[PDB]
Design a protein around this ligand. Structure first.
Ligand SMILES: [Mg+2]
Ligand SMILES: [Zn+2]
Ligand SMILES: [Zn+2]
Lengths: 64, 102, 103, 214, 137, 101, 82, 91
RNA sequence: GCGCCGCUAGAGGUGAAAUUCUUGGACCGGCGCAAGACGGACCAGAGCGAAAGCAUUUGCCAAGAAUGUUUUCAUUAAUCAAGAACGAAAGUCGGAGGUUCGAAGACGAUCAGAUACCGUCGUAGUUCCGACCAUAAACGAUGCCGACUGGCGAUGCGGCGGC
């Protein structure tokens, strides 16, 4: 229920998505171990190697 | 014009084959026109592997696979893009596409 | 019900072609009380006290009783004729082994 | 307003004495309030347990059933009900370009435990075999299938239920129809697929309490 | 202290959990080892107010949260998984709320034992509700 | 007794109360099926030939099988005289004047 | 192969055709002598035999009819004649 | 000879009662007036007495059968399942 | 579908939704039982059949091709007006049965309109026995019998020979 708002550094950017070229898949790593790594998506421009903070950490990836 | 040498179907020495039914739209197709696809998908959704093996009651658990045979009418095989419309001379090969697993 | 009931009714017609026998109730009754009948055959249709005493003299003559699974019109055609026969006794088989079968 | 989980209590479920691990798990049942006593509410509960959490090393794709037949206070004593395989194993071993043969037979023990045995078997591709289809012919199928059901009709009608269910913790039946059929056609995935229960012999209470002894 | 089993620190009790993850809904019903005494059934359609999202994976995510936050609240601590599809006459692949109901059941504090797909597969029976040309959307 | 025969059996001439000596499904072609024994509060249900399911006693005595004479309503009466002889043996009800006329 | 001398074939090519379709047709059968173990009586049994042939005095089974060419029963002395 | 061509046994009703009603009767009528092979003696002597009552000219044995035919197929379906339930589970 | 338990307010169905089912406790989970259908995966450019067609196990009955044959008879053959035999599904008449599906019809939608697509229900029908009808994109859109005229690998059934 209550999650810590957890921050995460990105490895390789997986190219644009989102049907308008608006969303970027980024594959974050959770700052505490590099073994735990989910693929997620942000909007706005990325700069590989930076830090972004997940308001809730694990929801879904882009697959049908 | 006759388009294909076999008539889209793999029957030669018969008169009649069984009708089976399409998976998504439930349409009556013969067993040898139907586009078959056998799926050996792991049931664990490989993103969710290192979240259950730490929650496991073992140290090395063999995760079960899921074995579901799909088969399609070709009006829903083309729309779902499991087969693709091909050129008139790249049609005469029955070899499957490559795998490309890693 | 598929392959091999031509052990009973095909060895029975072989005796019919070759060997010696009697058909009918009271002919077997004569043959079984003077010992000359080697094997008596009863049909499924035969009345229950007629069956009970044909078995009873073969207990006395020390001969075998076979219960042919079939009608008496079925046992008559299995003989190869247009009668209906519940009870027969083969008294000299030709060369087949109805006696040296299962009983 | 009322909580239905306060009127309940947790019993614990035991295995027959022929298994290594004896304590299966912990079921629960309501307490007695008048008519519904706490001993008919959990008779005939089937506990689908596998070998791997019931033996020290044995495989996970084989499960058993274990009906409840007695309550001895907190203890909940079980007796054999049937087995089958897990379905992931069952359709990993169904592959193309091989003949699948199956047999079934209704055999009762010397203990009065009429069973129905389901066995499968799959024809084997050889180690220098170049041709793709390792199919058997139909008269080879029929004499394998006669050989399959003849062997298990022996080794269940031999003696009581106890040595029969103890026979297929290691599944020496599937090894037996393996070795005795491969001079007809070689087979490679030969399991007793399912055991189904047809009769119960009167529930002698002494026979069950033999099964939870030493 | 009428609620809870008799367990120590180290020992855990098992109950089976049925993931009926079809389309149009998902069930994360959990029960005892015999499967006869229901411990906690909650449904993804009971925690959305949308009716599109009964079969969402986000509905199955927080339904699996609630069923684990009640299971551990009782005293049952580890779960067998008995995932289903619709099976039988209909489709035999599970729906979208299968994997999210399984992973949310693992991230939110619960141990996992034997897992198995248990959907009904027939020996060719029971003609299917489509007609002969199927359904034509 | 119906408490001893297993489920799905075909029964004619069954008692609707114990001792009644046979009341239900007595006409030609008729039968009743037993379903759903209840060993506690000893009472079984049956399926009457009108499709009504009805719970009865466990000890209602009943004869296994279907009544002889079935198929009797498959042949037409086919002329007015054979309906005359049909009801001459039963009652006085057959030439029925319409109340409209 | 425009110049196969198809009136004088090699006997290697002549052997490995059908018993019809040859330049001159001829059978694949023969006659064979069989010493049953324990008698003087050479039997002159046919190769592709069809009946169960028995010996005269030592009246055990001699050969068994099967699909094409007769399975002899005992490993017994044997020679192809003429 | 072929004295009639379609009506057969129901030529005795003549031009009366309809076309389908006469065609409905001539199936039932050739069935209650037939001589059936006796299962008890083998002679084709089973003649129908009153409705439901079937009797032998020889061996004199009375069988409770169907209304218009000797074996109602609803009744034979019962006997196949009664002996199934008898041997299976043994009550 | 119906019993008997368990826990709970929804379940169902759609691109959406609704008609509909539901605290006289539905769906869901368990144990049972009944009934009628249907034989999955193995199942293939594999087999058999004159064609239509034929797939659960064992088992009475009759048939059949191919192969093997230094057996037999010695042109007994080919195609065929007339005249017949069988022939999917639907359909008709009659009796059993009636689970599922489902023309017709009823409703809910979607729609400018919906006598359609989609959804809920559902009659005949679909299953069996008996009697009819004799038509299909009954298609390999290629009549049957006979011979000759390239190659190569493979397959199914026989027969023969070899590490
Ligand atoms: Mg009137
Ligand atoms: Zn489709
Ligand atoms: Zn008689």
């Amino acid at each position: 229920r209550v999650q810590p708002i957890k921050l995460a550094r990105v490895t390789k950017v997986l190219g644009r998505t989102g049907s308008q070229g608006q969303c970027t898949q980024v594959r974050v790593e959770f700052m505490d171990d590099t073994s735990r790594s989910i693929i997620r998506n942000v909007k706005g421009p990325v700069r590989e190697g930076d830090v972004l903070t997940l308001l809730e950490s694990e929801r879904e990836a882009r697959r049908l | 014009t006759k388009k294909r040498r076999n008539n889209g179907r793999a029957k030669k020495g018969r008169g009649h084959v069984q009708p089976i039914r399409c998976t998504n739209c439930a349409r009556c197709v013969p067993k040898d026109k139907a586009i078959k696809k056998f799926v050996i998908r792991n049931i664990v959704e490989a993103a969710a592997v290192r979240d259950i093996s730490e929650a496991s009651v073992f140290d090395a658990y063999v995760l079960p696979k899921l074995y579901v045979k799909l088969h399609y009418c070709v009006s829903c095989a083309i729309h779902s893009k499991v087969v693709r419309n091909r050129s008139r001379e790249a049609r005469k090969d029955r070899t499957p596409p490559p795998r490309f697993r890693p | 019900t598929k392959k091999s009931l031509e052990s009973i009714n095909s060895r029975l017609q072989l005796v019919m072609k070759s060997g010696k026998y009697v058909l009918g109730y009271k002919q077997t009754l004569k043959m079984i009380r003077q010992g000359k009948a080697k094997l008596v055959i009863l049909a499924n249709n035969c009345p229950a006290l007629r069956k009970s005493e044909i078995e009873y003299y073969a207990m006395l003559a020390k001969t075998g009783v076979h219960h042919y699974s079939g009608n008496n019109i079925e046992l008559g055609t299995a003989c190869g004729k247009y009668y209906r026969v519940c009870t027969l006794a083969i008294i000299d088989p030709g060369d087949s082994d109805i006696i040296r079968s299962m009983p | 307003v009322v909580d239905p989980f306060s009127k309940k209590d947790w019993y614990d479920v035991k295995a027959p004495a022929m298994f290594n691990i004896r304590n299966i798990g912990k079921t629960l049942v309501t307490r007695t309030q008048g008519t519904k006593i706490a001993s008919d509410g959990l008779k005939g509960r089937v506990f689908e347990v596998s070998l791997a959490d019931l033996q020290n090393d044995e495989v996970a794709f084989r499960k058993f059933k274990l009906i409840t037949e007695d309550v001895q206070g907190k203890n909940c004593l079980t007796n054999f009900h049937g087995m089958d395989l897990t379905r992931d194993k069952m359709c990993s071993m169904v592959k193309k370009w091989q003949t699948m043969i199956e047999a079934h037979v209704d055999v009762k023990t010397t203990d009065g435990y009429l069973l129905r045995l389901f066995c499968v078997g799959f024809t084997k591709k050889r180690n220098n075999q170049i041709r793709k289809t390792s199919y058997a012919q139909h008269q080879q199928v029929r004499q394998i299938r006669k050989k399959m059901m003849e062997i298990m009709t022996r080794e269940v009608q031999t003696n009581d239920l106890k040595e029969v269910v103890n026979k297929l913790i290691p599944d020496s039946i599937g090894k037996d129809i393996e070795k005795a059929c491969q001079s007809i056609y070689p087979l490679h995935d030969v399991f007793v697929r399912k055991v189904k229960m047809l009769k119960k012999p009167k529930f002698e209470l002494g026979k069950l309490m033999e099964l939870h002894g030493e | 202290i009428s609620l809870g089993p008799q367990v120590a620190e180290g020992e855990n009790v098992f109950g089976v959990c049925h993931i009926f993850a079809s389309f149009n809904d998902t069930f994360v019903h959990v029960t005892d080892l015999s499967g006869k005494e229901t411990i906690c059934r909650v449904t993804g359609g009971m925690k959305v107010k949308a009716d599109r999202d009964e079969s969402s994976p986000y509905a199955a995510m927080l339904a699996a949260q609630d069923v684990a936050q009640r299971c551990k609240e009782l005293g049952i601590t580890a779960l067998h998984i008995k995932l289903r599809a619709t099976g039988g006459n209909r489709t035999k692949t599970p729906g979208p709320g299968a994997q999210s109901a399984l992973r949310a059941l693992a991230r939110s504090g619960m141990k996992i034992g034997r897992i198995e797909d248990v959907t009904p597969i027939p020996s060719d029976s029971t003609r299917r509700k489509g007609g002969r040309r199927g359904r034509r959307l | 007794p119906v408490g001893t025969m297993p489920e799905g059996t075909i029964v004619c001439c069954l008692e609707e109360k114990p001792g009644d000596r046979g009341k239900l499904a007595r006409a030609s072609g008729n039968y009743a099926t037993v379903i759903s024994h209840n060993p506690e509060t000893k009472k079984t249900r049956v399926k009457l030939p009108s499709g009504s399911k009805k719970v009865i006693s466990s000890a209602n005595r009943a004869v296994v099988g279907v009544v002889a004479g079935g198929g009797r309503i498959d042949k037409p009466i086919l002329k007015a005289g054979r309906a005359y002889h049909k009801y001459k043996a039963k009652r006085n009800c057959w030439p029925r004047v319409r109340g409209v006329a | 192969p425009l110049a196969k001398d198809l009136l004088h074939p090699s006997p290697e090519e002549e052997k490995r055709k059908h018993k019809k379709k040859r330049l001159v047709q001829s059978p694949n059968s023969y006659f064979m002598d069989v010493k049953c173990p324990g008698c003087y009586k050479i039997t002159t049994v046919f190769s592709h035999a069809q009946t169960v042939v028995l010996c005269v005095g030592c009246s055990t089974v001699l050969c068994q009819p099967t699909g094409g060419k007769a399975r002899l029963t005992e490993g017994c002395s044997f020679r192809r004649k003429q | 000879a072929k004295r009639t061509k379609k009506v057969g046994i129901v030529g005795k009703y003549g031009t009366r009662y309809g076309a389908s009603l006469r065609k409905m009767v001539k199936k039932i009528e050739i069935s209650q007036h037939a001589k059936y092979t006796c299962s008890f003696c083998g002679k084709t002597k089973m003649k129908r007495r009153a409705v439901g009552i079937w009797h032998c000219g020889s061996c004199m044995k009375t069988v409770a059968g169907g209304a218009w035919t000797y074996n109602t197929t609803s009744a034979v379906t019962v006997k196949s399942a009664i002996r199934r339930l008898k041997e299976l589970k043994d009550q």
